[model samples]
Every structure is written in structure tokens, then in C-alpha cells.
Target: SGPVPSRARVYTDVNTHRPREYWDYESHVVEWGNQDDYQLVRKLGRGKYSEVFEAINITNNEKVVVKILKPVKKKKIKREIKILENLRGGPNIITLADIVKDPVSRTPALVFEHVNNTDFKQLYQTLTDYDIRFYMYEILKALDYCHSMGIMHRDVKPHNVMIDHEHRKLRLIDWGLAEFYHPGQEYNVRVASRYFKGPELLVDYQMYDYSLDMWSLGCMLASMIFRKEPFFHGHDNYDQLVRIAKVLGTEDLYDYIDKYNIELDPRFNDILGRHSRKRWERFVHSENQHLVSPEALDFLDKLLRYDHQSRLTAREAMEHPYFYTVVKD
Candidate 1:
């Protein structure tokens, strides 16, 4: 009952046919760089996986961000390194500059190109409607690039998106949760953060694909246009679905689960209330009306669908009319 029933699957432009060496993560050999080459400037930010610091290369005096990996399975570290290497030079991917290790503890670290990103909290308040569309379009380029290469970024939240608003640059970072997609493959559900997780993850439907990222992108866009830090603010994983169902409606949720033969967790019986699908226009207020356009609403509707198969793919989303202004700008 934890798993969803089999149905037509979604495959990327490139699939299982890609060379084994490209996705064969276990074969990755880490070529370590000299740890002394970098001088730490200050701490940048930290996540559950790693500690990040602003640093400079002593040899070339180049600025870089240093990510010192926390103690994790050696396999996880190699997977991240391999995926980063595979994705290098793709559109808006955070470039992995070098690999280094702590000489004493043999701790692994990844060095990457520095991006001057303002915290989303401060940045979102200052953006014009055009700025929101522009950045959303830029992120789609990265998502489409990676998805075309047969990888799914399990995590896609504002914290993972770095923006240099001055240069009009955006990069998708944190590939630790990313993995190559094989049709019919079951992936771990405990991957993405709660607020941005898709229905597949919540329902324990493991055979998901690149469409997972589209759901997350929809969440990010919703937050930006609605001026809500999280458009679906759930206190816990269970409540997360309750929160989504509140906006999307319980009847729609029941229809979706029924279509897939998904047996929802019984906990939802109490919390999932009857609700008509909330109209997108209801979220519009005088403060955010400029960013909430008909095109934007249409694009978001295509992305946040409960059926993963029905969600728009990254390439399809890039061609959306909502981003027409992106091309014009």
C-alpha cells in the first residue's frame, strides 16, 4: 500500500542508454588538491551535510566557496563528486573548482566558484515582477540541462538557488541529493525538504522522475509571486500533505490517489478537510498583484499537479508564455 500502482512513466531526453562510465559513481576516483592552497576568509552558511566557508586560492588569489563535507558514507561523498563532475559546464551549474582534503583528518572538501547571492528573505522583497520571471526562467535552463542529462535533482528550494541579481545570474547548487534516473527504478523518499517535496515523496511512490523537480520549482515560484515564505506551510511531513490538500482540495487529492491506487496514510483522515480548489486569484493582494499575472498562474498550474506524469517537464516549462518576457528582456 505504500507504493503507487504502475503506470506510464516519464523519461528524460537521455535515459538508461547513456555510457555506464558517465553514471557509474562507484568507480569515481577523487583527485585530491592541496588543502593549503586555500586561505579561509569567513564562514558563509552551513547545511545538514556540510559547512561552507568563503575562501581564496593562495596561488592565484581567486575567491572560492569551500564546502567541507560532514562525516558521511564514503559512497555518498563519491556520488556527489561524480555527479558534480558529470554536470560540470552545463548551463548555470555551480562549477566545482577543485577537490581538497584535510591533511590531518583526511576529511573531503569541495571548492566551487563564488556567487554573490543575497539571502532570499532580503532579495525577494526587492524584486520587480520582471525580476521574478527572469530568475525563474534562468533556473529552468539549469533544470532542463540536468534533466536532459538523465539526472533528477531531488532537492530544489530557494536556499539551493543562488542569485547574483546585479549580474542577472542564477545557479542551482547542492547536488548531494541528486541521482541519475533509470525507468522503473525506486528511489528513497526521504530526500527533499518538507515544504518543497512532491506528492510522490509524501505518498511513498518511489519510481519518480525529473518531474519531481518541477513540483519544487512550482513551490518556489508560488512563494515569490504570493510573497509567502512558503506557500504551503506545513508543520511536519504529514501536515505537509494536509497543507497542499488544503489549497488543492481534498476531493482532488482523493481522485489523484484513487487514479494511482495509492493508499494514503490513515493520519490524513482527521486532518484532510473538505475544500474546494482554491483559485490562484485568491492569493493576489495589492502588494503582489504585479507579479501575479494570468500567464504566471497558468504556468504554475501546470507544474504543481498531483499526478507527477501530468506535471510540466523543465523543457516544456521553459517554452511557457510566462517566460516570453524573459526572452524579450
Candidate 2:
């Protein structure tokens, strides 16, 4: 049986509500910039689709990032470019400086304002309670802004979130996996961003919406607050679901399975048995007591739910009591 389709509870009609030109990406052509003006300094990171680099702008004598895309479909490239254009000027969205390509090799690259990013693991360890709360709220601004614009950032993870702690600045980058969500469209799970799997995707479910990002944000938040590197530690896709079940409890997991009419793969029958939900507070310990709080657990509860529809929207997440102390900017 197929799982029932689920749409985001909020921002459901964003693409439809806006002008068609805003969401129409395929028709837009890439306007190439001068590749000679930018020099690739070194590799910053590598993604499944692109290689990230710190590059120097010879014209301005300033630092910039050039993400050179690997071989992929031309349509995919256009979609990435279109979404970035629409998201420009929005809060914390990465500003695309220009698009450039090597003439000889014909490799394509997108240039962006460079972020003075420290490794997230190193940075999170140094953050105080106030700092965590402040940044999470800042993260929500980008999420809410993109969702309201009718796009799903199918891949949302810490690496995609850039932090310049010196300036206390944050930017959401890498829209390669992002897409405009038109109502009634069934998104293929295979093509979706596998920044690790979500509960919905684990059960062979598709027809998901922007809530995927919230689940992603929840995983990112849970790890930081609880001091676990990855809140859901799974060896593989099958094990990822088991890891979630052990904490969220297999009972509530089963209940949602019934609601969605989801049938997990036959492999899970051997791998999974009954697991009682671990109490949220159980994760709080002497090691993490400093960061753990009542509000944090409650917010995590709403974000990590099996039912995608029940997870808090980005706008709603910003209003949570955990962030009550964060000053608006």
C-alpha cells in the first residue's frame, strides 16, 4: 500500500500564490561570468554534485567561494540557478555573486560571497546557551523565508548552514537540491537530498513537502543541544529508522505507520523489534546538563515527530519559548 500524500501544514500554496515567473526556473538561462577573474584558492568541501572552493576575486582582491558542479543534467543546473535568483535579498540566503565556467574544460561554477566559516563541530563546542538559542532563531529566518517563497530546501544540514561567528553572521547556502513545490506534485524520493534519511523516507514514503527541512533542522538541533554528533546514528538507511525508533519509541512509530498505510521493507522485520521510547530527559546528563532545558526538549519533540504534518513550521519554531530570550534583529 502507498503512504498517503502529505503537504506542509503552512506555506502550502506559496508557489501558486506568487507570480508564475517567480517559480518558473527551467526557462531561465545561465549568464556566464569571467572565469579568469576568479582563482580557485583551495578546496573547502565536496558535495555529491559539486566541489566547493575558496577562490580569490582578482578584480576586488576579496575572498569568494566557487562551487564547481560535477557532470549532471543541464536541467538540474538551471533549477539551482533559478531558485537562487528568486531567493536573493531574503534574510540569510546566500548571495550568489556570479556564475562562471572554464572555457577550455567547460566545467560550470557558481560564485558566492565567502563566509568565514569555522568547522561546525569546533564552533558548537565553544557556543554558550545564549549563543545556541540566538543562532537557531537565525537559522529559522532563512528556513521560513525559503518556505514562504514556495521552495523546499530538500537538503538542509549543518554544512549547508554557514556561520561567521566573528561577525555573528549566518547564511544558508547550497540551493542545488532545492526546488519549487507546486501543490499536487509527487516528488521522487530517489532524487531527493539524502543528507541522511528522514522518518517519512525511511518507510518507503514519498509525497513529502518542505517539512523535510524541519526534520533536518531537528536532527541538527538535537545533536548540538544534547552533545551527540548525530542525534540519529544509523549505520545505513535501515539502521537509521531503528535508531529513531529506539528514541522516539517503536510504538508511536508503528501508530504513524498505520496512519500512513506505510509498509516498511521486509528487511526491517529482522532488524527491528519492540523499543520503548527513550525519555527526552534521559539524554540530559552531567555532560549535557548545561545545554539541556525543558523548552529544548519540548521543541525537539515537535520537530522529530514521525508525522511530518505535525512538525512545527519554521515560522512557528521561531516563536517557541526556547527562543523567547533571543533578541530580534
Candidate 3:
């Protein structure tokens, strides 16, 4: 495109500053912990890739999360560990307490600090406007920490973020899809979930950076502020862009693609014609009226830009006026 996509505005050379051992996961060897140390107490949830359970650590008499991975390539498993290790002791980075494996079947499981999350669908309903800022700000702290460590969460959604509101804690979990960022790297667009995918992924523009996560956060923030789950509401991958285009407008979408030399998927021809941009103000109403503060709208607008280079970095986002009250003096 126009001289390749831009590098991240900040924390661009973290991996370069460190040795290859830091970012190179392929060379990492598994150091499995004892699986019997934790006892699975109850099933929490199940996804295609893993089965989650609430477990009790026998040695410490504390509850923890046990995420048992489905059979997959060892390469994928190693990458998750390496990224987690690099970002260890980070702010709300979902502490990876232990990595255990089954002796007989050789299945692997990741043990994590348990967050008493009340399922975002239910919890978001009870949130005050200030409460939303506090949690979103907390998530950004985690995001900035990861980005500064040269990694991107890739997947940032309400489901993946665990908030123990009772204790005022937030943990950014599920680093399985995360990746290390290198300047001008053409990464796999297949990383983030459909609804949370950035414009670069949908348009096949692979030269993306940490700003990708910002876009995902934007989708997430939009969902909560508007009381709309999965904000874009795309029926499928193809329609995802149409959903964004409808809100952001085809005009700017076209400008974005032209800027990056991205060609829309031919399949869009049959369905997408054109649409004007809808003002963010139009989305506000009585039900969500309180959440729609001027700064909230401004914050969301910057985060969800069609131009990836223009979206707010996690660090920059944290400094926005929307979080002014949330950040203590």
C-alpha cells in the first residue's frame, strides 16, 4: 500500500530490545507441573478449543481455574506459554500460576488465578456509568502492559475479560490467540473473533500492529456503552465489514481501503451497495442515555476508526478524558 502499514506509535521495539529467547516460542521446551496438585471441582464452561473448570489447589487450599486444552499442535501450546511467561507479573494479566499435563494422554492444562466473574451479560446490566469507566480503564492498563511487552491479546471481548466487581479486579484472560508484534509484520488475519476483528483482518490487509487490539477494545467498549452485545452484529464474516460500514459509512471505508490498497471481497458486491455514516449521537437514547457522555462517545469514536494507524493505542487511550474521574489524582 502506501509505503507499507505504520508501526505502532509506542513500544515498537520491545522484542528487538530483548534476546531471541524472549520472543522465539518454537525453541521453548515444555516444563509441565503436576496435574494432581489441583482437583477439578465444577465445570465452568466449554469452548471449541478448551474445557474450563473451577479447581481447588490441594497444596494451598485455594480455588483456581483449570483450562484443559483440546488436542492440537504443540507449537500452538508453546506460543501461549512463551507469551504468558514474557508478560508475567503484569497488571491484571491473568496470572498463569502453573502449566500441568496429564501423564497418560499427555493433555495439557493451564492453571490460573480464579476471578469471581459474574458473566458480563448479567454484570454489565448492573453497572453504573462510573463503574464502566473503572473496569474499562483497568482493562486498558492490562492492554498497555501487554503492548509494551511486545504482545497483542488478539482476542478482546467481554467474554474473555473477567471482572470481579465485588473485589474491583479485572483480568485479561485467554492469551491462546495472542501474538508478538514486529514492525511491519504481515500477521495472520485469522486471529481475533469475528465480531471483534479489526478492519485490517476483514479486508485482508496483513501489515497490522498492536492497534488491532485497540479496534477489538473499541468493539467491546461500544457494546457495553450502547447496551448492545457484539456491537457490530454481523451474521457472518463477510457481513462484518458491512455492519461496520453501515455505522462508519462506506465513504470512509472506501477511503480506508484505498489508503491501504485493500480490495473488498468480491462477495460483498451482491449485498453491499453504499451507506452514509451514522452519527454516534444517534445511538443514544433513554435506556443508555446516561452511559453516552460526550467523552464516552469521543473515546469510542477514536478507538473504532477505519484507519488502523489512527486508532488510539492502549497507552494513549488510558490518558483520555473519559477516564479522568476513574484515574485518581
Candidate 4:
């Protein structure tokens, strides 16, 4: 049952009217110089931090996707640049040809090799189960490498995974949320996406851990293969436990409440008390023709482990029988 939403108040506390920072690409050719000679063709997408566009290099006549960041906040811009600098190798990753600034807009632009492949969501829609698993396997490998280097991609999902035109290689994009752990500094919290959010995050705990990303990866993979988001039908965050209960099948609050050992945050309490095991059992065991192969589902189950301690790491998951025999390194 949905509660009547009150007057739908607009919250503007976090909104900022800051201006974009400008840099001269012509002056600093090494880092800020526009060496690609790429001419902006069309705008692809826009976000609070950056805008993506299609460009053609004048010298090599090569096409590419250019991401430009509007200077809104210095800290976020620096963090994004730092993360990209750290992940600077490999065709498996979105190759950063050059980092420059737009002369007209005076914003930073990251030039990447042109690949017209659709993202995982659209690409997977046209594929067979084998292809989906193969692509997801590649994603796991890339993530494993990033994790080995002490990077945690706070955001992980299908839209962020791009498939090449040939559907042969998979590349991870959007490192905006990448965090490099530093000692004693306050860790970035508020990691989210209710469907992909980890149990720890849901509980409002402030800890920087790799498990959160894996949880997101699991949720993403589950949606791609399962054809619906994990715990679907949660109209809002408060109602999400109802969805979670639909899959876990054991929502006895006394144990779950005591185990987590925290008062239900006010926002989540409205529906937390109503979790039902029967709903979850029905959700999981229900037959759906679009379901992914058992092997892929097997890995997702482990990745979505409620207990972060036991959730499979990218490294261990790569060795699963599903991946060992089928996927190419």
C-alpha cells in the first residue's frame, strides 16, 4: 500500500549555483592542451559535472567521444582527474587519448577513442545468454584490476559499461565516483542507488569498503540478466525493504533488527516493519523466460550476498566455472 505523498516538497539544500572553471588548452599542451585537434560534432549527454560530445580529430581524422567538465566544485574535479590519471592504461578501459579544455567554454574535456557501441543495457537486450555472461565477465576482470590498485568505483552499473561495435570488448566509463582511500581523511559517504546500495550503506554506516561496489555490480548484473532490478517495485526508498523481503524470504525483524543493531532510520521505518518472507520466496522462485543462465545467476547470488564479509570479490568471481571455461581473458 502506498502512503499519500505530502505536498511534494522540493529540497534545494544541496543545490549550488556555482560557475564552471575555465582552463586554456592551448597554453598547456601537455596536460591541458588540445592535441587531438578534434572538432566538436554533436553533444551526447549532459550531467552536473560533465558533458559528453562527439568529435573528429583534424590531424588523424579519427572520431572520438569527448567528456568536458564544467568547473562547479574544485574538489570533485580534482578527484575525477586523479582517478583517470591512475587508470591510464589498457584498451579494456576507456582509453584517455588526451585531457584538454574547451577554449570556448573553458571547461576540461577528456578525449577518448571513438567507440559507437551501445551500453550494457541496450546491447544486452539484443544478445543471447552466452553473450551477456561473456560481457559481464570482462567487466569483472577490469574491476578486479582496479581493485588491486586500491581504487573503488562507487558507481557500477550497466549504463557505465560500454560494448564495442563488434561486441568483442567491454569498457568501463564514468570514474567520477572513484575513490582512492587516504588515511585519516573523512571518507566520502552517501554512496547510493537503492537497488544497488549495500546493506551497510542502507544501515547508514560510514565505512569505506570495496564490498559496496561489488554489491552495486551484483545489483547491476542481476538487473541485466534477470530483466528487472533486484527487489523491484519499491516505489521509493522507504518501501524498498518490501522489495528486499520479496527476494530474501526471511524478514523476521527481531533478528534482522538486533543483528544490524540500529534503530531503523526514520526514512526507512515506514515499511521496514512490514517485510514478509513469503513475498521474497515468490519473487525468486517465480518462473521468467527471460532469466539468464544458471551459471551467471550463480555468480550474481554470491555477489548479492547480504553479508558483505562473504560477498565474492571480483578476483574470486573471475575463477568461477561460468567464467573459467567460457570467457576469454
**How many pairs of residues collide in each model?**
0, 0, 0, 3
lDDT of 1 by residue, 97-160 (tens): 9999998987789999999987666776789888888889889999988887878889999989
> Residue 50 of model 4: what lDDT?
78
Tens-digit lDDT track for model 4 on 224-294? 66566553546765555556555654354335445545455776655555444441123343343445556
Best by TM-score: 3
lDDT of 4 at 145: 69
Query: How does candidate 4 score on lDDT?
Result: 0.63
User: For residues 193-255, could you state the per-residue lDDT of candidate 2 as single tens digits?
Assistant: 343467887777777888888999999889888988777888877888888889888898888
Off by over 4 Å in 3: 1-3, 119-122
Higher-TM-score candidate among 2 and 3? Answer: 3
lDDT top scorer: 3
Alpha carbon lDDT at 166, candidate 4: 76
How should the candidates be ordered by lDDT, best one leading? 3, 1, 2, 4
- Model 2 regions lying over 4 Å from their true place: 119-122, 191-196
88-202, model 3: which lDDT tens digit per residue?
A: 8999998889999988878899999888987666776789899989989999999999999999889988878888877888899989999998887888988778999998888
Compared with the true structure, all predictions reach lDDT values of 0.88, 0.85, 0.88, 0.63
TM-score of each: 0.95, 0.94, 0.96, 0.78
Candidate 1 ranges with C-alpha deviation above 4 Å: 1-13, 119-122
lDDT: the better of candidates 1 and 3: 3
lDDT at residue 61 of model 4 (Cα atoms): 88
Q: Put the candidates in TM-score order, highest first.
A: 3, 1, 2, 4
